[PDB]
C-alpha cells in the first residue's frame, strides 16, 4: 500500500521526532552545546504534542499494513512524548555535572521516544518487533551512559544480554506464528482457524512471544532483570524505562491481543492468568524487604504490570478493560514520574563515578520538604490509596477483574495491595524521620515544578477523575 499525502498528517509526531533527531544530530556535529541541544529536543517533543493535536483534528487511519493511527495510538503516543519530556527535564541537572559527552543522551531519548510512538502506532508484527528494539537499543545507551560507574555497566550488561535473548525468543515466536498463519498483520493471525483455534504451532509461537514481551513487562519468571536494571541505571534513565517503555510495550501487547482472534483462546488466557497471579504476588512479596528505593520501585513495576495483566485478561468480556488500562496507565505514569523525578533531583548531579549513588530517603523532609511531600504523594498514589489517581486505576482494574469473574486474580490483587502498602507507606513515613547526616539552578527548578504539576495532577484526578475518563473514552480505537 502506497502512502497518500492525506496519510502524511497522521505520521506527524513520528516525523517531527525523526526530524528533531536529525536536527539535534547536526547541532551536536556543529557546536556541541548542551543547553541548545536540550532546548531543541524539548521543542521537538512539544511540537510533536501539538502535531498530535493536529492528528486529532484528522480521523483514524490505516496508513500501511505496518501502522494504524487512532485514539488508542494517540493517547499512548502522547504519554510517550510527555514521559520523554519529563526524562529530558530530569536529565539536564543530572547531565550538568557530567564529564564526558552530554548530548547523545538526548539523541537516544528522542530515538527511544520515536520507537515508543511506533509501538503505540503498531498494527503489525514487524512494527511491534522494530518498536521494541527501538526502545531497547537507546535503553542500552541510556543505562550504560555512566559506564565509568561499576553498577551502571553491570546493569547495561544484564539488560543487553537478557533483552537480546528476549528479542530472539520473540522473533522465533513470530516466525512460528507466521509459519502457522500466512500473514503478519494482527487481525490475520487466526483467520484461517475456525473449535480449531488452539493450533499447537500458533500457541507455541504466541507462548514464545509472551516470553519475549513479558521480559519487557517484567512478568515472572522473566522479572529478575528488573531491580538490577532499575538500580544500576541513572535515575532519569530509570524514569524513562519505568514509564515510557512499559507503557508502549503494554499498549502494543493489548492491541495485539485485541485485534488478533487468538485472545479468545482458553489456554493463552489461563497462562496469562497464572503469570499475572504469580507476578503480583512475587513482586509485592519481593519488595517487602527492600531498603533501596530503586529496587523497590522495580518490584513495584513488576506488581503494577501484574495489575495491568489482570486488567488485560478481561479484554474480551468486560469491554471496559481498554479504558481501565488507559486510566491506570496515566495514573502509573504520573506516579512513577513524580517518584523517579524526586529520585533524580536528589541524585543530581552525577558527582563522578566513584561517588555512591544512594538515594537515602530518610530525613528528606528536613532540607527539601517539597520533594518529600511530592514523594509521599507518589507513594500514596502507587499504593492504591484514595485522593490519588492510582486509586482510580486500582478501582478500574478491580472492576475489570470482578466483571469477568476473575476471582483468583481479584483476590491476588487485594492480597498484593495489602502486602504492598506496607513498604509504600513505610517509605512514605521514613522520608519524614530524622537523618543522621546529609540546588538553585533554573532547570533544577524546572524539574521541581514538573514533579509539582505531577503531584497536583494526581491529587486533582484522584479527587476528580472525570476529565481523564472523558478523554480516555473519547480515544476509542477501531473495534
Amino acid at each position: 500500500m502506497t502512502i497518500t499525502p492525506q496519510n502524511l498528517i497522521a505520521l506527524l509526531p513520528l516525523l517531527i521526532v525523526g526530524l528533531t533527531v536529525v536536527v539535534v544530530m547536526l547541532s551536536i556535529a556543529w557546536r556541541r552545546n548542551h543547553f541548545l541541544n536540550a532546548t531543541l529536543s524539548v521543542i521537538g517533543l512539544n511540537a510533536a504534542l501539538v502535531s498530535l493535536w493536529f492528528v486529532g483534528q484528522a480521523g483514524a487511519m490505516d496508513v500501511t499494513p505496518l501502522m494504524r493511527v487512532d485514539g488508542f495510538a494517540m493517547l499512548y503516543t502522547g504519554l510517550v512524548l510527555l514521559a520523554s519530556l519529563a526524562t529530558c527535564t530530569f536529565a539536564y541537572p543530572w547531565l550538568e555535572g557530567y564529564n564526558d559527552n552530554k548530548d547523545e543522551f538526548y539523541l537516544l531519548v528522542l530515538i527511544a521516544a520515536l520507537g515508543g510512538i511506533l509501538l503505540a502506532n503498531a498494527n503489525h508484527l514487524a512494527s511491534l518487533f522494530l518498536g521494541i528494539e527501538l526502545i531497547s537499543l537507546p535503553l542500552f545507551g541510556l543505562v550504560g551512559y555512566a559506564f565509568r560507574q561499576k553498577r551502571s555497566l553491570e546493569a547495561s550488561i544484564k539488560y543487553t544480554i537478557l533483552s537480546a535473548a528476549a528479542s530472539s525468543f520473540l522473533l522465533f515466536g513470530m516466525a512460528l506464528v507466521y509459519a502457522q498463519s500466512g500473514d503478519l498483520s494482527f487481525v490475520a493471525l487466526g483467520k484461517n482457524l475456525g473449535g480449531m483455534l488452539n493450533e499447537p504451532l500458533l500457541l507455541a509461537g504466541f507462548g514464545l512471544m509472551i516470553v519475549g514481551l513479558g521480559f519487557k513487562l517484567s512478568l515472572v519468571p522473566f522479572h529478575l532483570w528488573t531491580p538490577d536494571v532499575y538500580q544500576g541505571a541513572p535515575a532519569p534513565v530509570s524514569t524513562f524505562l519505568a514509564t515510557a517503555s512499559k507503557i508502549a510495550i503494554f499498549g502494543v501487547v493489548m492491541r495485539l491481543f485485541l485485534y488478533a482472534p487468538v485472545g479468545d483462546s482458553e489456554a493463552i488466557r489461563v497462562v496469562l492468568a497464572i503469570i499475572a497471579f504469580a507476578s503480583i504476588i512475587f513482586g509485592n512479596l519481593m519488595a517487602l524487604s527492600q531498603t533501596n528505593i530503586k529496587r523497590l520501585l522495580g518490584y513495584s513495576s513488576i506488581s503494577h504490570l501484574g495489575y495491568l495483566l489482570v486488567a488485560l485478561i478481561a479484554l474480551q468480556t468486560g469491554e471496559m478493560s481498554m479504558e481501565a488500562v488507559g486510566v491506570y496507565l496515566a495514573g502509573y505514569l504520573f506516579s512513577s514520574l513524580g517518584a523517579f523525578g524526586v529520585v533524580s533531583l536528589m541524585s543530581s548531579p552525577y558527582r563522578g563515578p566513584d561517588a555512591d549513588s544512594l538515594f537515602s530517603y530518610r530525613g528528606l523532609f528536613w532540607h527539601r520538604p517539597i520533594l518529600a511531600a511530592v514523594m509521599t504523594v507518589m507513594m500514596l498514589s502507587l499504593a492504591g490509596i484514595p485522593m490519588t489517581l492510582g486509586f482510580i486505576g486500582k478501582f478500574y482494574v478491580l472492576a475489570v477483574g470482578v466483571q469477568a469473574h476473575l476471582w483468583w486474580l481479584v483476590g491476588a490483587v487485594v492480597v498484593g495491595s495489602a502486602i504492598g502498602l506496607y513498604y509504600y507507606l513505610r517509605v512514605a513515613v521514613s522520608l519524614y524521620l530524622h537523618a543522621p547526616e546529609q540546588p538553585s539552578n533554573w532547570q533544577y527548578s524546572a524539574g521541581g515544578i514538573v514533579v509539582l504539576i505531577s503531584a497536583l495532577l494526581v491529587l486533582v484526578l484522584g479527587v476528580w477523575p472525570q476529565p481523564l475518563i472523558s478523554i480516555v473514552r473519547l480515544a476509542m480505537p477501531l473495534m
Binding site: 514487524a126 535473548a165 522465533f172
Partner: protein
Amino acid sequence: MIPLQHGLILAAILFVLGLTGLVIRRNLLFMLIGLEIMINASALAFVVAGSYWGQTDGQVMYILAISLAAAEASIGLALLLQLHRRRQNLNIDSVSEMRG
C-alpha cells in the same frame, strides 16, 4: 519438495543449541556468540516460513533480524571491550555486585 517441519525443526535445534551455549558458558564473548546463534535461528525460521507461503515478508523480517543482530552485536562487543578495559576479565559471574 521439502516439508516445512524439517526446516522448522532445524531452526528449533539451532535456537536450542544457542540457548545452551548462552547458559552453560561463563565467557561473555561466548554468550554473545550464542545470542547471534539464536538470532540466526530465528531469522532462518522466518525465512523458512516466508518461503513456504511464497511471500517476501519473511525475507523482510530476515533483514530486520540481521539489522538488529548487527546493531546489538555492536552493542554487546562495545560493552565487552569496556568490561575488559575496566575489570580486566571477561567473566560474567564476577560482575554480580548488584544482588537482591
